[PDB]
Amino acid sequence: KLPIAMRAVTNYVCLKEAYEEQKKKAADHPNRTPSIWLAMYRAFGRPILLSSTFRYLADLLGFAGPLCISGIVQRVNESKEFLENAHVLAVLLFLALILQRTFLQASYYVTIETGINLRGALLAMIYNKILRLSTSNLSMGEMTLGQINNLVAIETNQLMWFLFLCPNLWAMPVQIIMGVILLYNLLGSSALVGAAVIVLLAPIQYFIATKLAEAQKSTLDYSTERLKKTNEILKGIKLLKLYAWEHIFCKSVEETRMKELSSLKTFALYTSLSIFMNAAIPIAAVLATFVTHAYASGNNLKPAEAFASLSLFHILVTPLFLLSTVVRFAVKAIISVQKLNEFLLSDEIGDVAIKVTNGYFSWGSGLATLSNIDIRIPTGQLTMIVGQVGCGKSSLLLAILGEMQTLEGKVYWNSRYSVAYAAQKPWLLNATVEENITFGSSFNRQRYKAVTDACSLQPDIDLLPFGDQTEIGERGINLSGGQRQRICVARALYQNTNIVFLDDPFSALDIHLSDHLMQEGILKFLQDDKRTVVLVTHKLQYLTHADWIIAMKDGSVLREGTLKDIQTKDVELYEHWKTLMNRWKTCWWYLTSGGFFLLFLMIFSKLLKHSVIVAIDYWLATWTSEYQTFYVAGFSILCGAGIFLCLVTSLTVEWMGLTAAKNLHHNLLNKIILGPIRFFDTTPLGLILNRFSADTNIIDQHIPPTLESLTRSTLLCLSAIGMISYATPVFLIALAPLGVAFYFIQKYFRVASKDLQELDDSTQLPLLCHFSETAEGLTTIRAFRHETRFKQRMLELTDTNNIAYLFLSAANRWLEVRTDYLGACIVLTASIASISSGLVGLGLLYALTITNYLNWVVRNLADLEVQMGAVKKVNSFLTMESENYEGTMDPSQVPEHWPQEGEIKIHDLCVRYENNLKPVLKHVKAYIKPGQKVGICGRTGSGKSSLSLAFFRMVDIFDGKIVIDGIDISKLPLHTLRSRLSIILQDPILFSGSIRFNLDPECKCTDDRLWEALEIAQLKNMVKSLPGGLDATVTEGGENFSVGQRQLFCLARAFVRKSSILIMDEATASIDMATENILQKVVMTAFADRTVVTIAHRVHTILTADLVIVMKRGNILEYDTPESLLAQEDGVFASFVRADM
């Protein structure tokens, strides 16, 4: 598989020991942070020392070119002592070249092996850090899951790509110094002047780098913001699309994109300047050197010296060809390692089964969210935690699990025992249903059936494509909220631990499923195993089953004891409970995105630049053929023209890159955000978000450099071939066999490359997903205490990915070695042809360039093929389906206040989510009067939510009309329909930013109206107490607030719009009973004029409703007042009321 030295385990151990030594040295002195660079050096330097040795040998051998060329020129111009003989020199040059290329490829091999080792070690390090990072980092707003994914995907890769090029950072200096020294032997003091010019690259390239670094950091800043926004949109599209806010958010994404593009433009401008310097300073150096030689030594050079010096200048130019790339990648790698070091230095986690005494706990800020927590959880008994929204229940569970800072007190666990945690926000992995349920336990079919039937999952799984083997979670079929919650509860029930922490498992479930779960699963299955159970529920009806009750109010514990103990001690609390219960083409597209002016300017300017630059060489050769003011002036104007042409050629490629990046991302975002909701239902969020996160990165920062290097190298190679052939025609024959060879090697590489490339991706998507599904659901992993299994899985995945990438690099090395030997053959053939008249001097001169730049032509062509494959995905998404926002209704017919009265009439409505599916709604017909209060109820899977989403045309209608206040909704534009009606979905979708931003993204609401909304939604006091008020922050996903508070914010978001018709879809699922009562009464007293249709989670709420509807499998069974339905003996509605009560 993978050699032991290349396993991620050994590399990780080495790097970790180096980093721990660094941490010791950092602890020694104040303000000295541990550094990743020194740890990486300690761990992996000796390999790089060997690679640098090989590179120095390669450069020493490379200097043999000038000497042999000069000898051949001298001997063409005019035993065993025949080493001057031209043909012997040619063969010796061939041997020197092949030896050089062998050493160079050896250095490349060593460095790629080391870089893969280190990517493995760094991914293991940051993964263990994930398994140790405190969730308060992600909940208080320090960092995001997206930032961690960015680390893993982009920043580690950038560090690796830099470490592929690291030897150059000291090999290129040496080679450029040596060169100058050798020039000093041929040209005398003249070389010094040229040397000085060359040395100016050292100051310059520092300055530029500085700028680049800043410009990069800013980009990485704005990018991270942009992506954040993007992700939220893709995760909350439904809400946005239901509120008509799609474009308000698209505009903010585009603003951040404009900032990122400006930073990218600064980076591109300075990259262009670095290219211009690296190209022109050589021309300036040659100009200075040869003018000084012409006017200092009265004699012109003999041809031998002339071609020797010109060859030495070529050898100088070769490093400067790649200097720009190495500085670019070193800057980006410095930024990436800064981010990695910031991450790796962050905050981390710190009878009676559990006893918390004198506990004061806080969520990081240093202010106590819990206080005077004196609790005990009896062993093998049902503990139930009760309290209104935001009262420290989930906080209590996560405090016992040591997930939050402990200010005072202690938790005793009669080290922690494993405990089955069913998080309130269900976390599902990217494996099958069976893998999610078993979750690392040996499959027992009897126990599996017990769990599955206790959670009623069997009816739902048998529907799925393959019941127990269908892939779930992101990157799989998306289950409903209730199904995911019941799968998570099944996982909690299946693991063979002795403590089960079930956090509100009945939020998404209906009455029947919840009652079945309670009775069978929790009152029979869990008690047969004699397991301790701690339930966090608002269902007061189940308090009779509880053995121990922990009431919580405002962070502290109100009272603790059995029901009788509470009744005798806290009479008021028991009475309160009682009252509450009531007892390719893509490459062409990328090139042409500039409009045919940038493209043709690029091609013509490049051709003209190389024309001038070869004319300079021909001029030097012919000028030294003499051994004059005419020659000097011609040379000077030629050099000036070359410098200006370099300046022009530098900017065109970068400008093309900027233009194409902007256009591609703009089209992608807009077309995505206009897609129908079905597209998001079917497609994983991961694919769409990958487009932006990774492919936009490729399109912005990785295609332009590849393209410019490819164009320069290919023009150099074609020019050298043409020059050689013009000098020696016969070379053309040699070109045909060689040509064939080239073709074939290319061919073979491709058929393998593709395959290997695919493998790489296929092996990396799992790894990334792993890092994603541990960062999410970290608390569940660490509550089951399964960190070891997940670390082992990460090591396995990273080793597989390393194998794939190593084989890919091996194929690349195969192609590079073959093409280098082919270039050496080109050199030898052209050399023999030239030896057997000014033409042939420059012809033989360019043969070395042929090898040097043919390698790069091939490599960059491969890189560009991969990156154009990236571009293809955006261009593919451009073919999506688009929702019909136009609408047939004339805008004149729509009154200024369309839902003026609020009457609705549904006639023969039939709905199916996608073509060729079952009709979820079947001929429903109902007329809600203006100012009517309608309550819709029923089991899960009865089409209540479909009837809700019908009004907003988010479900495709086969037949029927929805005539809202005298206009068929089918005709109106989508935006008018979806802006003048307000829906309160069940799952809260809360964006990042201030409270104000979530309550009105447009900024078009008075502060007074926001306070009104928050007062109806029962969040006035909490927002008042928050530090910033209405400017207080909401971290991504609303994690800093409880679930009930997230739902209440989602209710406030609907109370501000103040439209005439409200559709409340199971809004009080997560809210407790007392908050729910007061909220319903206040909402009814406030919206008494409007028409509100409430899909009810508890039928009690809809007992005081003007009209009631009970849906069963897409049909309205009963349509009448709640009094009439209650009067019926054995009616469905009557049955619902008895069970809930």
Ligand SMILES: CC(C)CCC[C@@H](C)[C@H]1CC[C@H]2[C@@H]3CC=C4C[C@@H](OC(=O)CCC(=O)O)CC[C@]4(C)[C@H]3CC[C@]12C
């Ligand atoms: C000109 C000949 C003799 C050698 C050609 C390369 C060298 C000039 C060396 C010496 C100085 C080096 C540069 C000086 C230091 C930097 C900055 C470094 O980035 C940073 O220092 C962080 C940015 C910051 O300091 O705020 C990236 C590498 C780079 C460009 C180095 C790249 C390699 C350089 C150009």
Ligand SMILES: Nc1ncnc2c1ncn2[C@@H]1O[C@H](COP(=O)(O)OP(=O)(O)OP(=O)(O)O)[C@@H](O)[C@H]1O
């Ligand atoms: N992840 C978090 N990070 C920081 N503060 C939090 C976090 N979760 C909750 N809080 C704060 O803790 C306080 C108590 O909320 P808690 O998490 O205990 O909710 P809960 O009572 O379990 O929720 P509910 O019963 O509505 O589902 C709230 O004021 C909230 O501001």
Ligand SMILES: Nc1ncnc2c1ncn2[C@@H]1O[C@H](COP(=O)(O)OP(=O)(O)O)[C@@H](O)[C@H]1O
């Ligand atoms: N996103 C979806 N795509 C296709 N079909 C769906 C989707 N959601 C639900 N359904 C189907 O529609 C029916 C009713 O679902 P739903 O409207 O969610 O019921 P509820 O009223 O309980 O929310 C179910 O039988 C289910 O198969």
Ligand SMILES: CCC(C)(C)/N=C(\NC#N)Nc1cccnc1
């Ligand atoms: C040394 C600078 C001058 C302009 C005198 N000569 C160059 N400059 C470049 N580039 N010659 C050359 C040609 C082709 C491939 N490599 C090098």
Ligand SMILES: [Mg+2]
């Ligand atoms: Mg909770």
Ligand SMILES: [Mg+2]
């Ligand atoms: Mg529903």
